[PDB]
């Protein structure tokens, strides 16, 4: 079917083309690896020009028909959810395993043996890093927080945000503690609302313990703050998934007003129907009415005299963050409204942010919730977008630091340690696996050499220097300098990477490398 | 095939050509328009009867459609100069293109990642801004007459504001809060204290930097010859959230014993505090009595709940810095103050710092009758301090006529004297781009640039050089005798914008072709 | 030797625009002078027109070359300021562009070339003022002779005896003293069919373009009148959407009549409260200007009505009369009116034209509208253009006093003086003074070429005679040689030669300052 404009490669030209196709795509982000990596000018299909060095943003904007390069995109979707820092590093590491696999294919090595060769070599590298890793919480409690404060500083060190970075460092520590419990040790991104707007500065960003839900308070006469109402417990809010309207059948409608006589009849008719539905709010004792649909003019008049601020046009997902922070429930209809399902919070007020005329509102708690909302501002639209993604990566590092106390020192010291460990174990394991372990260690050298290239240094001369300091002297962690520093030995400069984070990166690199080798056949049809 | 709708990633070397040859060609369009004697350019449309002629650099760049995606970024960079100031945008685009001419000569002769060359421009731009400060003069002369103009405009700003109750006292406070600075006019040097139970006219000015919330319990109320340290740590009840972690112990006392061991490791950091030779310590969180008792024996004074903002304003007036970690003892930048006094005003405990190192600053304590009187007084005062200080940075000029451009060239050449191995060419090329500015001014004026600049450089190189570009006689003449001066803010804006312009373009290794419209 | 190579060639692109600009001057070169050759131009619409006037040629030439379009704007400024010499100012520009080509071959930057033309233009005018014969506006004998010679170039000659003082007396009333530029748009030449050339009325106050009401009730005359300008139109309501009037009953007929007559009367009542004697309604052919019922209403109120006023005169009548435009009746009051002693309709033969005298306003000054009559349509046309050129020559004397002898006389002597004064200069500029003097000789050389006389022979006769005498000899086509242009009644005002040199230095500047061109949309 559709023999024209149809290409197929099996067992001959596919093995050579799959390696060169992924090599040309991975070579794009090699220069962007590390904080010193170089930016790129990206153009959206709508015509917007953006500039960022993040590998995830660059790879996500790629829409391509290359069958092998799609496997790099499918993994990148899981990289942001699992880790988020394994975007550029794994793709370069996965392509390094492919370049070493192509050299073995030319030698007559079976591709599945290469897949099993990298799998057994990855398991040996985990055991070596497990012995040489160090503990944080065992060193001190405040030194752990010092790593969290400097974890966001590393991601923000390459951006203008680095001036005020001390503000966002504390926002990442207080947010993870609330949304994550030390039992499961998991930070759900769906429980963290990321919202930002253009204008102001980066120092005006505040950390809110609950949903923001910007609203104009409907009618302007309604008050800007919600009072406890004479010793009542917290502040009760109403979550309604049904619109507030006078009851009407499904058949006719067609309401015609001939004169003022019929105008006063319909006005008092709809007002009396509003008095029946507001009683359910009064019986439940809800201070503010939050609904998914808009309100009428007479609807806000009765809510104004009763001191009941009105909130209309709230999205479905926005109502989900309300019940989680305030420990409320989703009430489907008006007859099911009860005081037990009302969200309880500390207060609701309107806080002016800088010179912005939006004048958003803040709903606080003062108690530990199951969700938080990160609020970010900046003087430029790019600064806001870069600060949201850098904060997202900072929240993921903190998740891995608490989940696993063991960590490794990055900056090239981890990859060189993995190479010297596998190369030593390569001679201990004889047979075909000997060459499979040597090729795996040579592929691990791509990351520190790429970081050496991206640092403006000789990749070959620097790689031999790190191997000389970790052997003739003693076994330790000394990496390449990505950003200009005082000297080498990252262990002295306190550059830390999560062990479970680096372990997740090396597994996804070998997982995708196998799937690339497990597919020797590519069949694509034409474009009708 | 990547991206979509005729959008593909250009070749690596072609990306640098589009970022240089493509951008310089756009920059060369308005390059001949620099100066009053510059050239002109015609702008023609498809209908050809709608065309026009103008010498405006901002009009030529924005009107001409640019298919080069690198040229679109250059237009967005030029918008920064228009929004910040709005004058001299043409000179910014020309100088930004001259940096690309030198960066192209540095790359093609190297072919190494430009990010290192970017660090060469940052060190060279700092030396260029330092040369503009040494040669900076002022029309600010007769500040006594400017003092009478500052107090009258301040009273005009107080109109319609609740501060209009007494105009003379509040305008005198703002007068002594500006002219007495003799330095940066930023609001971070002026601390605003808001208290209740007083009258607005009863407010006073204190040159010392004033805090609130007095520190310590058994600590003394006065500190003489204070050494200020900045750190962020929690010494009171560490391990904030212990819930959820599996605890296997024989008794509950081992949980608190572990917290004592976690704080025992902090004793090494407590010892590092005394190794700094300081009598005073500042922390954002609180501190338990036991680590505070160790501060008393070692002579350390603990300050609690200083937050961050208020700390940063203290480190600037005292000449210190903020750091949340201790890397190694006796390595840091420390601030100091002569006298620390604990006072009380408005029924609230306050702190008084006096005798800061090179301290230039003031603190305005306003007495309101409510929160509305305090909040509206702080915002309306900053609006008056911003306008009155705007005339301090402007009308302050430097010697112009190409002089200061060459003065920066020899200053960058001085930076090119003591320099790293691979950073010598990156810094030296920055001085080459500074020497291309008088070359362009001589070419647009119709003169010989090689004869003037060579005689202008050799004269300004060594000593006794007031000389600059004289376009009337076509020779090198003294600018001080001719009275040719240009604003210092214009020099600082063009150099800073061109430095940021080089950062945006050089950090881009590969450029994707923009969507054709 | 070894000099600046100039790898990129922005100047070579400018040299291509100079050659393209000199090609336009070569076409206009043949049209210089009254004996110049005609040019045939075929418009894209298919119209075939011919004439020797450089202003009409460059307007219909439809030049797509942007640099060459500047010659059209200079000819527009040449006619707006001096009014004559639009052909010679373009030829003088091409000579400076040709002389600049030799300067670019010597390695001279065009900035000094353009800056040296500034001092060359200012010096050429100062030398021209030294040889200029100073005349004053108080002498009416010199102005008539200057206007009579401008009218001798047209079919109407013997009838110019009454036409010459018409342009003289009209300017002397509007000239006052030290008025500098006097806009000739304030002088309105009214063209009406019928009568003869000898019949003319100045009517210094003002003259309208329209007749009076021919319907029932038209006053056609008013005494002690106040004249407003109404851009509105008094009509029954007529929305731009679809409307229809259907009367099925006697009650429906009275309903339409009462609503229309009351709406028209309410507008008429507000006009009488402002004491408005005369009304000027803007002409609109779409809807009704003034209803016939409104004519009967305004006739009962003793209000003179003149409708169908041309939209071109709305801007003119708002200035000379010192009034203000009225968009709506609600803003229509007495303060925007004029003052008129008598407003009447006078018909010489068949014209029935309205004239107004005695504006009596401080803000409004003597704006004069002249009526021109004639039998054939070709009479009032050529007469209007002939008197317009006579007003331009007199306008030159009002802004700048003095006159010079035309025919290429000043171009020869100034070129001889700048050649001698070039020794006082030094450096690159000194060579430009020599080329600038040689570029001023293209005008007298072309006059000798277009007249059939020997090019090289006549030009040398001017340099020979102008040595002993001063401005006493020039080129005249009447004697077919070099003779005295002052005795032959050839008089060119000094402002024409002053503006021609000034606009030439500004035109060549705007050319040479263009180093490149790019597509901009």
From Swiss-Prot, chain A:
Keyword Nucleotide-binding among record annotations: yes
PROSITE patterns: TCP1_1 (PS00750), TCP1_3 (PS00995)
Stored InterPro entries: Chap_CCT_epsi, Chaperone_TCP-1, Chaperonin_TCP-1_CS, Cpn60/GroEL/TCP-1, GroEL-like_apical_dom_sf, GROEL-like_equatorial_sf, TCP-1-like_intermed_sf, TCP-1_chaperonin
Key words of the record: ATP-binding, Chaperone, Cytoplasm, Nucleotide-binding
Domain of life assignment: Eukaryota
SUPFAM superfamilies attached to this UniProt entry: GroEL apical domain-like (SSF52029), GroEL equatorial domain-like (SSF48592), GroEL-intermediate domain like (SSF54849)
Cell location: Cytoplasm
Role this protein plays: Molecular chaperone; assists the folding of proteins upon ATP hydrolysis. Known to play a role, in vitro, in the folding of actin and tubulin. In yeast may play a role in mitotic spindle formation.
Family, per entry: Belongs to the TCP-1 chaperonin family.
PANTHER family with a match to the protein in the record: CHAPERONIN
Listed name of the protein: T-complex protein 1 subunit epsilon
From Swiss-Prot, chain B:
Pfam family, one: Cpn60_TCP1
GO molecular function, one term: ATP-dependent protein folding chaperone
Main location: cytoplasm
Compartments (UniProt record): Cytoplasm
A GO cellular component entry from the record: cytoplasm
Record has Methyltransferase as a keyword: no
One GO BP: protein folding
InterPro entries (alphabetical): Chap_CCT_beta, Chaperone_TCP-1, Chaperonin_TCP-1_CS, Cpn60/GroEL/TCP-1, GroEL-like_apical_dom_sf, GROEL-like_equatorial_sf, TCP-1-like_intermed_sf
Transmembrane in keyword set: no
Top-rank taxon, per record: Eukaryota
Keywords: Acetylation, ATP-binding, Chaperone, Cytoplasm, Nucleotide-binding
Function: Molecular chaperone; assists the folding of proteins upon ATP hydrolysis. Known to play a role, in vitro, in the folding of actin and tubulin. In yeast may play a role in mitotic spindle formation.
Subunit structure, as described in the record: Heterooligomeric complex of about 850 to 900 kDa that forms two stacked rings, 12 to 16 nm in diameter. Interacts with PLP2; this interaction leads to inhibition of CCT complex mediated actin folding.
Family: Belongs to the TCP-1 chaperonin family.
Name this polypeptide is given: T-complex protein 1 subunit beta
Species of provenance: Saccharomyces cerevisiae (strain ATCC 204508 / S288c) (Baker's yeast)
Gene encoding the protein: CCT2
Swiss-Prot record, chain C:
Organism: Saccharomyces cerevisiae (strain ATCC 204508 / S288c)
InterPro entries: Chap_CCT_delta, Chaperone_TCP-1, Chaperonin_TCP-1_CS, Cpn60/GroEL/TCP-1, GroEL-like_apical_dom_sf, GROEL-like_equatorial_sf, TCP-1-like_intermed_sf, TCP-1_chaperonin
Recorded name of the encoding gene: CCT4
Subcellular localization: Cytoplasm
A cellular component term, taken from the record's GO annotations: chaperonin-containing T-complex
Regions annotated as coiled coil: none
Main location, first listed in the record: cytoplasm
Highest taxon in the source lineage: Eukaryota
Protein name, per record: T-complex protein 1 subunit delta
Self-association state and partner proteins as the record states: Heterooligomeric complex of about 850 to 900 kDa that forms two stacked rings, 12 to 16 nm in diameter.
One MF term in the entry's GO annotations: ATP hydrolysis activity
GO biological process terms, semicolon-separated: chaperone mediated protein folding independent of cofactor; protein folding
Sequence similarity: Belongs to the TCP-1 chaperonin family.
């Amino acid at each position: 079917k559709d023999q024209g404009n149809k290409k197929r490669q099996h067992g001959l030209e596919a093995k050579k083309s799959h390696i060169l196709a992924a090599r040309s795509v991975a070579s794009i982000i090699k220069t962007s690896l590390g904080p010193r990596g170089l930016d790129k000018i990206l153009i959206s299909p709508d015509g917007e020009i953006t500039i960022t060095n993040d590998g995830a943003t660059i790879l996500s904007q790629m829409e391509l028909d290359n069958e092998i390069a799609k496997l790099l995109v499918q993994l990148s979707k899981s990289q942001d959810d699992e880790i988020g820092d394994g975007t550029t590093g794994v793709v370069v590491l996965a392509s390094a395993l492919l370049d070493q696999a192509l050299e073995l294919i030319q030698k007559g090595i079976h591709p599945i043996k290469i897949a099993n060769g990298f799998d057994e070599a990855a398991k040996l590298a985990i055991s070596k890093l497990e012995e040489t890793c160090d503990d944080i919480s065992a060193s001190n409690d405040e030194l752990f927080r010092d790593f969290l404060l400097r974890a966001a500083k590393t991601s923000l060190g390459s951006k203008i945000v680095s001036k005020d970075h001390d503000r966002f460092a504390e926002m990442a520590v207080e947010a993870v503690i609330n949304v994550m419990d030390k039992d499961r040790k998991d930070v759900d991104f769906d429980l963290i609302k990321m919202q930002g707007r253009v204008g102001g500065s980066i120092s005006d960003s505040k950390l809110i313990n609950g949903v923001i839900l910007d609203k104009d308070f409907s009618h302007p006469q309604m008050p800007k703050c919600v009072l406890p109402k004479e010793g009542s417990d917290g502040v009760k809010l109403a979550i309604l998934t049904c619109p507030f309207e006078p009851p009407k059948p499904k058949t006719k409608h067609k309401l015609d007003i001939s004169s003022v006589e019929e105008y006063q009849k319909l006005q008092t008719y709809e007002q009396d129907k509003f008095k029946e539905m507001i009683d359910d709010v009064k019986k439940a004792g809800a201070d503010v009415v939050i609904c998914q649909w808009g309100f009428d003019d007479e609807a806000n008049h009765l809510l104004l005299q009763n001191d009941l601020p009105a909130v209309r046009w709230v999205g479905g997902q926005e109502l989900e963050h309300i019940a989680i922070s305030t420990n409320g429930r989703i009430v489907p209809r008006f007859q099911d409204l009860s005081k037990d399902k009302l969200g309880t919070c500390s207060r609701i007020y309107e806080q002016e942010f800088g010179t912005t005329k939006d004048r958003m509102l803040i709903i606080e708690q003062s108690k530990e919730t199951k969700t938080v909302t990160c609020f970010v501002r900046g003087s430029n639209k790019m600064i806001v977008d870069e600060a949201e993604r850098a904060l997202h990566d900072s929240l993921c590092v903190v998740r891995n630091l608490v989940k696993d106390s063991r960590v490794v020192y990055g900056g090239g010291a981890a990859e060189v340690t993995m190479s010297l460990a596998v190369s030593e174990e390569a001679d201990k394991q004889r047979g075909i696996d000997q060459y499979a372990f040597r090729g795996f260690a040579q592929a691990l050298d791509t990351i520190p050499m790429t970081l050496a290239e991206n640092s403006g240094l000789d990749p070959i001369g620097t790689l031999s220097t790190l191997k000389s300091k970790q052997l003739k002297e003693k076994i330790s962690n000394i990496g390449v300098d990505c950003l200009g520093y005082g000297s080498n030995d990252m262990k002295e400069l306190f550059v830390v990477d999560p062990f479970i984070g680096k372990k997740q990166q090396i597994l996804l690199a070998t997982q995708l490398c196998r799937m690339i080798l497990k597919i020797d056949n590519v069949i694509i049809s034409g474009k009708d | 095939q990547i991206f979509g709708d005729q959008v593909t990633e250009e070749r690596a070397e072609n990306a640098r050509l589009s970022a240089f040859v493509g951008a310089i060609a756009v920059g060369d369009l308005v390059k001949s328009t620099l100066g009053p004697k510059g050239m002109d350019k015609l702008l023609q449309s498809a209908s050809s009867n709608t065309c026009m002629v103008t010498n405006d650099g901002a009009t030529i760049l924005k009107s001409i459609p640019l298919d080069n995606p690198a040229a679109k970024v250059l237009v967005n960079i030029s918008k920064v100069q228009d929004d910040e100031v709005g004058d001299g945008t043409t000179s910014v685009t020309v100088l930004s293109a001259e940096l690309l001419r030198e960066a192209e000569k540095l790359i093609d002769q190297s072919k190494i990642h430009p990010q290192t060359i970017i660090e060469g421009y940052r060190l060279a731009s700092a030396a260029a801004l330092d040369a503009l400060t040494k040669a900076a003069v002022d029309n600010s002369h007769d500040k006594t007459m400017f003092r009478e103009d500052l107090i009258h405009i301040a009273k005009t700003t107080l109109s319609s504001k609740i501060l209009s109750q007494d105009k003379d006292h509040f305008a005198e406070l703002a007068t002594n809060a500006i002219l007495r600075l003799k330095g940066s006019t930023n609001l971070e040097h002026i601390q605003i204290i808001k208290i209740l139970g007083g009258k607005l006219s009863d407010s006073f000015l204190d040159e010392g930097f004033i805090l609130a919330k007095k520190f310590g319990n058994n600590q003394p109320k006065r500190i003489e010859n204070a050494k200020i340290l900045i750190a962020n740590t929690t010494l009171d009840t560490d391990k904030v959230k212990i819930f959820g972690t599996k605890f296997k112990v024989d008794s509950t006392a081992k949980l608190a014993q572990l917290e004592k061991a976690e704080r025992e490791k902090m004793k090494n950091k407590i010892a590092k505090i005394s190794k700094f030779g300081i009598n005073t310590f500042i922390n954002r969180q609180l501190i338990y009595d036991y680590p505070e008792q160790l501060f008393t024996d070692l002579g350390i004074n603990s300050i609690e709940h200083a937050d961050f903002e208020g700390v940063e304003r203290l480190a600037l007036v005292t000449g210190g810095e903020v750091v949340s970690t201790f890397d190694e003892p006796s390595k840091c930048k420390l601030g100091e103050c002569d006298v620390i006094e604990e006072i009380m005003l408005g029924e609230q405990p306050f702190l008084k710092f006096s005798g800061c190192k090179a301290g230039e600053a003031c603190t305005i304590v306003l007495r309101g009758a409510t929160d509305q009187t305090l909040d509206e007084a702080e915002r309306s005062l900053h609006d008056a301090l911003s306008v009155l200080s705007q005339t301090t940075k402007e009308t302050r000029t430097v010697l112009g006529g190409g002089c200061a451009e060459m003065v920066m060239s020899k200053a960058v050449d001085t930076e090119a004297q003591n320099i790293d191995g691979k950073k010598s060419l990156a810094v030296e090329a920055f001085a080459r781009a500074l020497r291309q500015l008088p070359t362009i001014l001589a070419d647009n004026a119709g003169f010989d640039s090689s004869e003037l600049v060579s005689k202008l450089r050799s004269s300004i190189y060594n000593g006794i050089s007031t000389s600059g570009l004289d376009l009337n006689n076509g020779t090198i003449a003294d600018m001080r005798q001719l009275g040719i001066v240009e604003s210092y803010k214009l020099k600082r804006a063009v150099v800073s914008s061109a430095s940021e312009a080089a950062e945006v373009l050089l950090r881009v290794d590969n450029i994707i072709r923009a969507r054709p419209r | 030797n070894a000099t600046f190579k100039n790898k990129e060639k922005p100047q070579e692109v400018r040299k291509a625009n100079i050659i393209a600009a000199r090609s336009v001057a070569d076409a206009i070169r043949t049209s210089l002078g009254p004996k110049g050759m005609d040019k045939m131009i075929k418009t894209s619409r298919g119209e075939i027109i011919i004439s020797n006037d450089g202003h009409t040629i460059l307007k219909q030439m439809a030049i797509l070359h942007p640099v060459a379009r500047m010659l059209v704007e200079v000819s527009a400024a040449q006619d707006s300021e001096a009014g004559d010499g639009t052909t010679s100012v373009v030829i003088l520009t091409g000579a400076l562009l040709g002389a600049a080509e030799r300067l670019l071959n010597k390695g001279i930057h065009p900035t000094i070339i353009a800056d040296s033309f500034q001092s060359a233009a200012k010096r050429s005018v100062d030398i021209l003022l030294e040889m200029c014969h100073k005349v004053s506006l108080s002498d009416r004998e010199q102005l008539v002779r200057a206007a009579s010679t401008s009218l001798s170039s047209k079919i109407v000659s013997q009838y110019s005896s009454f036409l010459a003082p018409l342009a003289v007396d009209s300017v002397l009333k509007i000239s006052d003293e030290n008025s500098k530029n006097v806009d000739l748009n304030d002088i309105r030449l009214v063209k009406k069919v019928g009568g003869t050339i000898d019949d003319t009325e100045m009517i210094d106050g003002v003259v309208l373009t329209q007749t009076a009401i021919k319907s029932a009730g038209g006053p056609t005359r008013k005494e002690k009148a106040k004249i407003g300008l109404i851009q509105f139109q008094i009509s029954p309501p007529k929305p731009d959407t679809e409307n229809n009037i259907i009367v099925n009953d006697y009650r429906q007929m009275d309903k339409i009549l009462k609503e229309e007559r009351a709406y028209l009367l309410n507008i008429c009542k507000k006009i009488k409260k402002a004491k408005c004697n005369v009304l000027l309604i803007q002409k609109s052919i779409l809807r009704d200007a003034v209803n016939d019922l409104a004519l009967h209403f305004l006739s009962k109120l003793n209000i003179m009505v003149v409708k169908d006023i041309e939209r071109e005169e709305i801007e003119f009548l708002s200035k000379g009369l010192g009034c203000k435009p009225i968009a709506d009746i609600e803003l229509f009051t007495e303060d925007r009116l004029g003052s008129a002693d008598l407003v009447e309709e006078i018909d010489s033969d068949g014209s029935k034209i309205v004239r107004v005298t005695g504006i009596r306003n401080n803000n409004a000054r003597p704006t004069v509208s002249v009526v021109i009559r004639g039998a054939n349509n070709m009479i009032i046309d050529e007469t209007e253009r002939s008197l317009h050129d006579a007003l331009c020559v007199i306008r030159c004397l009002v802004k700048e006093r003095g006159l010079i002898a035309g025919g290429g006389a000043p171009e020869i002597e100034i070129s001889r003086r700048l050649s001698k004064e070039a020794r006082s200069m030094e450096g690159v500029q000194a060579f430009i003074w020599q080329e600038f003097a040689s570029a001023l000789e293209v005008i007298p050389t072309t006059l000798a070429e277009n007249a059939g006389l020997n090019s090289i022979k006549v030009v040398t006769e001017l340099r020979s005679k102008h040595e002993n005498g001063e401005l006493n000899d020039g080129i005249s086509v009447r004697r077919s040689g070099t003779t005295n242009t002052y005795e032959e009644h050839i008089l060119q005002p000094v402002l024409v030669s002053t503006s021609a040199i000034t606009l030439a230095s500004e035109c060549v500047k705007s050319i040479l300052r263009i180093d490149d061109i790019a597509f901009s949309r």
